[PDB]
């Protein structure tokens, strides 16, 4: 008799969730620094356990035995990637004590010596070389906001932090355009495996 | 009845697994050309969100849930109309399917090997930057296939919906065996 009420609750909750995913697939993948980012963090964090709970709900009230097998497989692999994310994130937080190690996109961080401090942001575009652009007192490294750095005070060495190694990167070559802008690159030297 | 909600639960878990696969991969893995995944999931999830909001508005728990479902239906309609307007405005001008990217107002055309390669660029300044790293080219954060540093074009184009902007090779440098950097700047804009 109360099937209609739980059906309406499920419809309302999943409509809100499907709205929350839709403003993450669009509007959130270009803008990756400040705006439409808390929504992306919430969706990408609750993405794995809600899928695990959905496979658990499918396994609890199943259709066939093959449905039980595939739902158990999906729940097991979802728990496997969630456990792997928590292991890699705990390792990265233990190696580098920053909250930015707890994001679910990548397990690599970029540390830049800006202004007497070190600014840490997640780094998805990891390769041998890391580029850096300046916008006349506004600096972006690998598509990430990094403050308001100038060009004459560019850092000569940045680091990236992984769960296993810490890789140093020295500034090899730079070119200046405009009044205060510039573009520099950072190539790898001296990986340190603590 | 009974079996119907079981099939509904199985279908919901399966489609949430494809949403799981498409969100964690494709775009933020290594940025290759499998962006059709996000496109096909977004084209599935726009009328899915419309249908769920409409069905929640048709049979509401109360008035507040009805007005919230109507608000999210109008929001999904507004964002779908905005996406179609901004993508149709970039398809009558350029003959590239990368205008159907979820958020794109510029397209970067880079010629090498006798062919141009079009990528859905997100935002460009007045001076874009090419980075060649081994046998691979990255231009404004987009993986432009494989291209050597010495065979880098001295002219690229970017196609805004109202203008065509021509960028030319202003500066260049090399540091590795075939790895290098390059700075392109605008010299002439063309009114569409």
């Amino acid at each position: 008799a109360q099937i209609i009420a739980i059906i309406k609750d499920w419809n309302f909750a999943w409509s809100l969730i499907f709205l929350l995913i839709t403003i993450v697939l669009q509007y959130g993948y270009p803008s990756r620094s400040m705006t439409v980012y808390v929504f992306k963090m919430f969706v990408l964090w609750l993405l794995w356990p809600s899928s695990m709970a959905l496979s658990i709900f499918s396994a609890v009230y199943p259709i066939d035995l093959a449905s039980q097998i595939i739902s158990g497989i999906v729940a097991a692999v979802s728990a496997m990637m969630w456990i792997s994310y928590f292991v890699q994130s705990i390792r990265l937080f233990m190696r580098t004590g920053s909250w930015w190690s707890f994001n679910p996109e990548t397990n690599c961080l970029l540390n830049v010596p800006f202004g007497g401090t070190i600014v840490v942001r997640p780094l998805v575009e990891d390769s041998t070389s890391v580029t850096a652009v300046v916008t006349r007192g506004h600096l972006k490294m690998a598509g990430m906001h990094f403050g308001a750095c100038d060009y004459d005070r560019l850092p000569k060495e940045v680091t990236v932090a992984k769960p296993n190694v810490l890789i140093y990167l020295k500034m090899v070559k730079r070119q200046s355009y405009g009044t205060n802008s510039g573009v520099a690159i950072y190539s790898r030297y001296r990986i340190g495996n603590y | 009845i009974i079996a119907i909600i079981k099939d509904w639960n199985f279908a919901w878990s399966l489609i949430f697994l494809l949403i799981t696969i498409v969100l964690q991969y494709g775009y933020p893995s290594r940025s290759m050309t499998v962006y059709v995944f996000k496109m096909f999931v977004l084209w599935l999830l726009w009328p899915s969100s419309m249908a769920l909001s409409i069905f929640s508005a048709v049979y509401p728990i109360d008035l507040a849930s009805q007005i919230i479902s109507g608000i999210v239906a109008a929001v999904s309609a507004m964002m779908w109309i905005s996406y179609f307007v901004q993508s149709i405005r970039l398809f009558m001008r350029t003959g590239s399917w990368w205008s159907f990217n979820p958020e794109t107002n510029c397209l970067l055309n880079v010629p090498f090997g006798g062919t141009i390669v079009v990528r859905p660029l997100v935002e460009d300044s007045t001076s874009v930057t090419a980075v060649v790293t081994r046998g691979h080219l990255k231009m404004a954060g987009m993986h432009f296939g494989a291209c050597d540093y010495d065979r880098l074009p001295k002219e690229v184009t970017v196609a805004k919906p109202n203008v065509l902007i021509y960028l030319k090779m202003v500066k260049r440098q090399s540091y590795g065996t075939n790895s290098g950097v390059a700075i392109y700047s605008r010299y002439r804009i063309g009114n569409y």
């Epitope: 202004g115 041998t128 060495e157 140093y168 001296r190 340190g192 | -």
Partner: antibody, heavy 113, light 112 residues
Framework: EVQLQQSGPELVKPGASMKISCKTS????????MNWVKQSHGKNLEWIGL????????SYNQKFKGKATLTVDKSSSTAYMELLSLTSEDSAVYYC??????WGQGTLVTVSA | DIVMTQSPASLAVSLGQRATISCKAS??????????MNWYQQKPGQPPKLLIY???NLESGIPARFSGSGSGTDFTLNIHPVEEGDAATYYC?????????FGGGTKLEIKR
């Protein structure tokens, strides 16, 4: 202009403790990892250890673990290496570097009675 | 832990002639896809000056007379245009594992 001036030559008793002060100038001090290298009698270079100035995290050689300690002073923009329990096999020249390019002037340490 | 030896002890190379310094290690220095051996030059009474970063690259301000080659275990520093300001001692460093073991050092003197 990155410069790393050291303290100067010192003579110490065989079994005392002493400190080399590598003073830097020119760059933003917190952020470039300082690396200490020891050059022995004649021409033989040995790595002592690196230290992050901002984080304070160190990394030592196996032979120099506990023999020398690396400290950072951010206010004077300096780093220090303390050598303890000096022996006859410690009379060596000590260099400080940052990005393996800008080295120090060199401190000659003599250990004799 | 890493034992590094250099095959030449002292060099006898005139002006304009090839000078080869070989620094063969024993372990694998390659991380990911790059060998990390640094090549250093030291004049007497001076701290060492870095020439080669990652087995191939060159220091900015160091001329292209010095070249680095080799991969895996065998490495070579090569100078075709040996000039007058060249007599020094050259070193190799792994820059990959923890102890950062320097080389034995090769003394290069210009034949007169």
């Amino acid at each position: 202009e990155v410069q790393l001036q050291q303290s100067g030559p010192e003579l110490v008793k065989p079994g005392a403790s002493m400190k080399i002060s590598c003073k830097t100038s020119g760059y933003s001090f917190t952020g470039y990892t300082m690396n200490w290298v020891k050059q022995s009698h004649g021409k033989n270079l040995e790595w002592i250890g690196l230290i992050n100035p901002y984080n304070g995290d160190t990394s030592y050689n196996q032979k120099f673990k506990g023999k020398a300690t690396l400290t950072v002073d951010k206010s004077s923009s300096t780093a220090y290496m303390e050598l303890l329990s000096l022996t006859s096999e410690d009379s060596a020249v000590y260099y400080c570097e940052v990005i393996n390019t800008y080295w120090g002037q060199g401190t000659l340490v003599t250990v004799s009675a | 832990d890493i034992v590094m030896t250099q095959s030449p002890a002292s060099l006898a190379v005139s002006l304009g002639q090839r000078a080869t310094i070989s620094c063969k290690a024993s372990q694998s220095i390659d991380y990911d896809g790059d060998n990390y051996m640094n090549w250093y030059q030291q004049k007497p009474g001076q701290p060492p000056k870095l020439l080669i970063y990652t087995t191939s690259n060159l220091e900015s301000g160091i001329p292209a007379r010095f070249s680095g080659s080799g991969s895996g275990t065998d490495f070579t520093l090569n100078i075709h245009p040996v000039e007058e300001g060249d007599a020094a001692t050259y070193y190799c460093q792994q820059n990959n594992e923890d102890p950062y073991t320097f080389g034995g050092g090769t003394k290069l003197e210009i034949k007169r």
